[PDB]
Design a protein around this motif. Sequence first.
Motif, PDB file in Angstrom:
ATOM      1  N   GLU A   1       0.822  -1.206   0.000  1.00  0.00           N
ATOM      2  CA  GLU A   1       0.000   0.000   0.000  1.00  0.00           C
ATOM      3  C   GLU A   1       0.860   1.262   0.000  1.00  0.00           C
ATOM      4  O   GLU A   1       0.495   2.253  -0.636  1.00  0.00           O
ATOM      5  CB  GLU A   1      -1.013  -0.015   1.153  1.00  0.00           C
ATOM      6  N   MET A   2       1.994   1.259   0.706  1.00  0.00           N
ATOM      7  CA  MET A   2       2.876   2.427   0.671  1.00  0.00           C
ATOM      8  C   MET A   2       3.576   2.576  -0.677  1.00  0.00           C
ATOM      9  O   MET A   2       3.799   3.700  -1.134  1.00  0.00           O
ATOM     10  CB  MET A   2       3.874   2.396   1.822  1.00  0.00           C
ATOM     11  N   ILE A   3       3.965   1.467  -1.313  1.00  0.00           N
ATOM     12  CA  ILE A   3       4.511   1.548  -2.670  1.00  0.00           C
ATOM     13  C   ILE A   3       3.449   2.070  -3.632  1.00  0.00           C
ATOM     14  O   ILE A   3       3.737   2.887  -4.517  1.00  0.00           O
ATOM     15  CB  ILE A   3       5.083   0.187  -3.110  1.00  0.00           C
ATOM     16  N   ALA A   4       2.198   1.633  -3.448  1.00  0.00           N
ATOM     17  CA  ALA A   4       1.094   2.146  -4.254  1.00  0.00           C
ATOM     18  C   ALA A   4       0.871   3.630  -3.986  1.00  0.00           C
ATOM     19  O   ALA A   4       0.526   4.387  -4.896  1.00  0.00           O
ATOM     20  CB  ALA A   4      -0.178   1.351  -3.973  1.00  0.00           C
ATOM     21  N   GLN A   5       1.062   4.055  -2.736  1.00  0.00           N
ATOM     22  CA  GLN A   5       0.943   5.463  -2.374  1.00  0.00           C
ATOM     23  C   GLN A   5       2.042   6.291  -3.027  1.00  0.00           C
ATOM     24  O   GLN A   5       1.800   7.422  -3.461  1.00  0.00           O
ATOM     25  CB  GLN A   5       0.984   5.612  -0.856  1.00  0.00           C
ATOM     26  N   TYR A   6       3.256   5.740  -3.096  1.00  0.00           N
ATOM     27  CA  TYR A   6       4.352   6.419  -3.782  1.00  0.00           C
ATOM     28  C   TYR A   6       4.075   6.547  -5.270  1.00  0.00           C
ATOM     29  O   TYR A   6       4.323   7.607  -5.857  1.00  0.00           O
ATOM     30  CB  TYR A   6       5.665   5.670  -3.576  1.00  0.00           C
ATOM     31  N   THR A   7       3.543   5.487  -5.890  1.00  0.00           N
ATOM     32  CA  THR A   7       3.166   5.571  -7.300  1.00  0.00           C
ATOM     33  C   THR A   7       2.038   6.570  -7.507  1.00  0.00           C
ATOM     34  O   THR A   7       2.019   7.275  -8.515  1.00  0.00           O
ATOM     35  CB  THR A   7       2.770   4.205  -7.856  1.00  0.00           C
ATOM     36  N   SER A   8       1.098   6.642  -6.562  1.00  0.00           N
ATOM     37  CA  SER A   8       0.017   7.620  -6.639  1.00  0.00           C
ATOM     38  C   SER A   8       0.549   9.041  -6.552  1.00  0.00           C
ATOM     39  O   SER A   8       0.059   9.936  -7.246  1.00  0.00           O
ATOM     40  CB  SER A   8      -0.986   7.376  -5.520  1.00  0.00           C
ATOM     41  N   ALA A   9       1.544   9.265  -5.690  1.00  0.00           N
ATOM     42  CA  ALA A   9       2.151  10.586  -5.570  1.00  0.00           C
ATOM     43  C   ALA A   9       2.891  10.962  -6.844  1.00  0.00           C
ATOM     44  O   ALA A   9       2.816  12.110  -7.298  1.00  0.00           O
ATOM     45  CB  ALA A   9       3.095  10.623  -4.372  1.00  0.00           C
ATOM     46  N   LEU A  10       3.590   9.995  -7.444  1.00  0.00           N
ATOM     47  CA  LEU A  10       4.277  10.239  -8.710  1.00  0.00           C
ATOM     48  C   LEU A  10       3.289  10.512  -9.837  1.00  0.00           C
ATOM     49  O   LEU A  10       3.530  11.386 -10.675  1.00  0.00           O
ATOM     50  CB  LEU A  10       5.172   9.054  -9.049  1.00  0.00           C
ATOM     51  N   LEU A  11       2.175   9.774  -9.870  1.00  0.00           N
ATOM     52  CA  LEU A  11       1.142   9.998 -10.878  1.00  0.00           C
ATOM     53  C   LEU A  11       0.493  11.363 -10.712  1.00  0.00           C
ATOM     54  O   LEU A  11       0.246  12.058 -11.701  1.00  0.00           O
ATOM     55  CB  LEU A  11       0.082   8.903 -10.801  1.00  0.00           C
ATOM     56  N   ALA A  12       0.224  11.766  -9.469  1.00  0.00           N
ATOM     57  CA  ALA A  12      -0.396  13.060  -9.220  1.00  0.00           C
ATOM     58  C   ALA A  12       0.552  14.190  -9.589  1.00  0.00           C
ATOM     59  O   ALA A  12       0.124  15.213 -10.136  1.00  0.00           O
ATOM     60  CB  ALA A  12      -0.824  13.167  -7.762  1.00  0.00           C
ATOM     61  N   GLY A  13       1.844  14.013  -9.303  1.00  0.00           N
ATOM     62  CA  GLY A  13       2.820  15.010  -9.700  1.00  0.00           C
ATOM     63  C   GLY A  13       2.970  15.111 -11.205  1.00  0.00           C
ATOM     64  O   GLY A  13       3.035  16.213 -11.750  1.00  0.00           O
ATOM     65  N   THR A  14       3.025  13.973 -11.901  1.00  0.00           N
ATOM     66  CA  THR A  14       3.232  14.034 -13.342  1.00  0.00           C
ATOM     67  C   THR A  14       1.974  14.456 -14.084  1.00  0.00           C
ATOM     68  O   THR A  14       2.073  14.925 -15.219  1.00  0.00           O
ATOM     69  CB  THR A  14       3.758  12.703 -13.894  1.00  0.00           C
ATOM     70  N   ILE A  15       0.800  14.303 -13.481  1.00  0.00           N
ATOM     71  CA  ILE A  15      -0.438  14.701 -14.133  1.00  0.00           C
ATOM     72  C   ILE A  15      -0.743  16.167 -13.869  1.00  0.00           C
ATOM     73  O   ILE A  15      -1.033  16.930 -14.793  1.00  0.00           O
ATOM     74  CB  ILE A  15      -1.587  13.778 -13.675  1.00  0.00           C
ATOM     75  N   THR A  16      -0.644  16.599 -12.612  1.00  0.00           N
ATOM     76  CA  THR A  16      -1.008  17.966 -12.273  1.00  0.00           C
ATOM     77  C   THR A  16       0.117  18.959 -12.523  1.00  0.00           C
ATOM     78  O   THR A  16      -0.159  20.145 -12.715  1.00  0.00           O
ATOM     79  CB  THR A  16      -1.443  18.051 -10.813  1.00  0.00           C
ATOM     80  N   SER A  17       1.372  18.513 -12.521  1.00  0.00           N
ATOM     81  CA  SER A  17       2.497  19.428 -12.606  1.00  0.00           C
ATOM     82  C   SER A  17       3.473  19.145 -13.741  1.00  0.00           C
ATOM     83  O   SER A  17       4.412  19.922 -13.925  1.00  0.00           O
ATOM     84  CB  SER A  17       3.266  19.437 -11.280  1.00  0.00           C
ATOM     85  N   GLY A  18       3.276  18.080 -14.507  1.00  0.00           N
ATOM     86  CA  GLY A  18       4.225  17.731 -15.559  1.00  0.00           C
ATOM     87  C   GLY A  18       5.559  17.265 -15.018  1.00  0.00           C
ATOM     88  O   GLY A  18       5.623  16.398 -14.143  1.00  0.00           O
ATOM     89  N   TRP A  19       6.645  17.817 -15.549  1.00  0.00           N
ATOM     90  CA  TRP A  19       7.978  17.486 -15.066  1.00  0.00           C
ATOM     91  C   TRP A  19       8.513  18.478 -14.051  1.00  0.00           C
ATOM     92  O   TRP A  19       9.680  18.368 -13.665  1.00  0.00           O
ATOM     93  CB  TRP A  19       8.977  17.368 -16.220  1.00  0.00           C
ATOM     94  N   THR A  20       7.710  19.459 -13.642  1.00  0.00           N
ATOM     95  CA  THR A  20       8.189  20.483 -12.722  1.00  0.00           C
ATOM     96  C   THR A  20       8.466  19.913 -11.337  1.00  0.00           C
ATOM     97  O   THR A  20       9.395  20.360 -10.657  1.00  0.00           O
ATOM     98  CB  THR A  20       7.186  21.623 -12.649  1.00  0.00           C
ATOM     99  N   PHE A  21       7.661  18.943 -10.894  1.00  0.00           N
ATOM    100  CA  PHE A  21       7.804  18.397  -9.548  1.00  0.00           C
ATOM    101  C   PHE A  21       9.082  17.584  -9.392  1.00  0.00           C
ATOM    102  O   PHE A  21       9.573  17.430  -8.271  1.00  0.00           O
ATOM    103  CB  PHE A  21       6.582  17.548  -9.186  1.00  0.00           C
TER     104      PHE A  21
END
Lengths: 106, 170, 50, 50
Positions: free
Chosen positions: B95-115
């Motif tokens: 679940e924490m690895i899934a949470q890390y992937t979710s954070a990466l997905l949210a960063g790449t979707i909402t912010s592109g490569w800026t994050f």
Amino acid sequence: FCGKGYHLMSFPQSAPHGVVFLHVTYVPAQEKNFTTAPAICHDGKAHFPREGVFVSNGTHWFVTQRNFYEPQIITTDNTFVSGNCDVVIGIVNNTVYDPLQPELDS
Amino acid sequence: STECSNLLLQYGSFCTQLKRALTGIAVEQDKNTQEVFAQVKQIYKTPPIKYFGGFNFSQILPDPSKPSKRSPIEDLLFNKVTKGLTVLPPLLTDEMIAQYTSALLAGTITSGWTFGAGPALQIPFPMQMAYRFNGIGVTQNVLYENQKLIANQFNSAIGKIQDSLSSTPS
Amino acid sequence: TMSLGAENSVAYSNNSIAIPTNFTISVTTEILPVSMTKTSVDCTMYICGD
Amino acid sequence: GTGVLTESNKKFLPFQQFGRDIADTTDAVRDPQTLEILDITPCSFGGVSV
Ligand SMILES: *[C@@H]1O[C@H](CO)[C@@H](O[C@@H]2O[C@H](CO)[C@@H](O)[C@H](O)[C@H]2NC(C)=O)[C@H](O)[C@H]1NC(C)=O
Ligand SMILES: *[C@@H]1O[C@H](CO)[C@@H](O[C@@H]2O[C@H](CO)[C@@H](O)[C@H](O)[C@H]2NC(C)=O)[C@H](O)[C@H]1NC(C)=O
Ligand SMILES: *[C@@H]1O[C@H](CO)[C@@H](O[C@@H]2O[C@H](CO)[C@@H](O)[C@H](O)[C@H]2NC(C)=O)[C@H](O)[C@H]1NC(C)=O
Ligand SMILES: *[C@@H]1O[C@H](CO)[C@@H](O[C@@H]2O[C@H](CO)[C@@H](O)[C@H](O)[C@H]2NC(C)=O)[C@H](O)[C@H]1NC(C)=O
Ligand SMILES: *[C@@H]1O[C@H](CO)[C@@H](O[C@@H]2O[C@H](CO)[C@@H](O)[C@H](O)[C@H]2NC(C)=O)[C@H](O)[C@H]1NC(C)=O
Ligand SMILES: *[C@@H]1O[C@H](CO)[C@@H](O)[C@H](O)[C@H]1NC(C)=O
Ligand SMILES: *[C@@H]1O[C@H](CO)[C@@H](O)[C@H](O)[C@H]1NC(C)=O
């Protein structure tokens, strides 16, 4: 690959059985919200930024580089025209300055 | 056998060597998981309105209905992968690895490569896709004019990916 | 329970962008091992001594 | 054994007869006739490369 942030340069340093890289990177900071649009509608034509992005501070529209806030007037030199205003979703109406216009005007 | 252990003590630090090598491998696996998934120190979250200019990320964003907080693709992936010996649990749970992937997905979707290069700077997803189009040498107008077609093609490809993973054993 | 990180909800909207107004020149260190200790072992002297 | 015997600076206690080094090999010995301590450095060992 070469540090956290946009990589500028790196410096090698010798170390016992190893190398230490001092990565000099560019990190953006002090970001500010702006209202953005994909294109500018002028004279029935759609204008797109050549290298920047369209930003608005509330009343005026400018074009700026993506990684630093440097607002510049939307002209025909930093934008290119492709198509009309009916296709692009979210196009806003704003004037596009022409550098040649004061020359033939005067 | 106590006597066997007494005779085993005559062989020296073989047992210590094997335990130390296995411990090095065990910490190395956790370090590998940290290096791959824990590349952001901010846990980004998606906005509650999942509208990204026609782009559908339901198959890759976490499902609120599932207790595991995994995406449908991740849930399919987890379903499709199945005397002194012990198995140590990983430091990062699923679940924490899934949470890390979710954070990466949210960063790449909402912010592109800026994050990935500093603070997360919000950008509309069509404008981000236009930036990506410029990266591969295609002008922004091509993305904006054909935005509905590009979004439909992306959604179709994501659906085909889920179907292909669900339909292929190997 | 270990904290993965600080929560940061990015304020995504369809018509707003965030543009940096400043920058930080950040120098970071990356340490990479290159070589090991070069060891030679006399097999006869290690196993048998003299 | 075989080794170079040198005069030792080690202060052996009265019970102590032979001495072990970092790696538990016999590096010092007390002579049974004259009670003096001698280091036993091993005879020179080299790797012969051509
Ligand atoms: C957005 O930026 C522009 C340019 O920086 C602002 O326009 C200027 O505003 C100052 C302040 O009143 C005036 O003195 C100038 O004459 C304006 N220049 C022009 C060409 O009009 C504009 O006010 C800013 N808008 C907001 C909402 O901050
Ligand atoms: C941008 O300007 C265009 C034309 O100046 C506007 O298009 C007109 O919109 C009105 C009201 O919706 C219609 O009655 C006209 O028929 C439209 N004309 C054309 C040529 O399309 C457009 O609405 C403006 N958009 C914004 C956001 O201000
Ligand atoms: C995004 O995609 C999902 C599925 O990939 C869409 O969910 C489907 O919606 C239709 C209509 O409501 C249903 O008939 C399907 O059963 C749904 N599929 C699944 C897997 O739930 C969703 O509508 C799309 N759009 C948005 C805005 O989320
Ligand atoms: C841009 O505007 C958004 C809101 O329109 C800001 O997001 C808010 O930030 C405050 C302070 O961190 C939070 O308390 C709110 O919960 C945020 N709202 C949302 C919807 O996320 C954002 O901080 C602004 N960006 C900048 C650089 O000022
Ligand atoms: C951009 O950021 C730098 C810091 O990284 C600012 O420089 C500081 O400015 C203040 C007052 O303006 C000084 O007291 C500090 O000593 C400065 N720091 C350094 C390292 O020089 C700079 O002013 C910022 N510029 C803008 C336009 O925001
Ligand atoms: C952006 O979103 C707002 C509300 O979410 C909506 O009213 C507006 O039409 C949207 N603009 C585009 C170009 O989709
Ligand atoms: C004989 O040995 C004793 C100890 O074993 C020593 O004290 C003494 O000096 C030795 N005598 C000679 C003549 O070596």
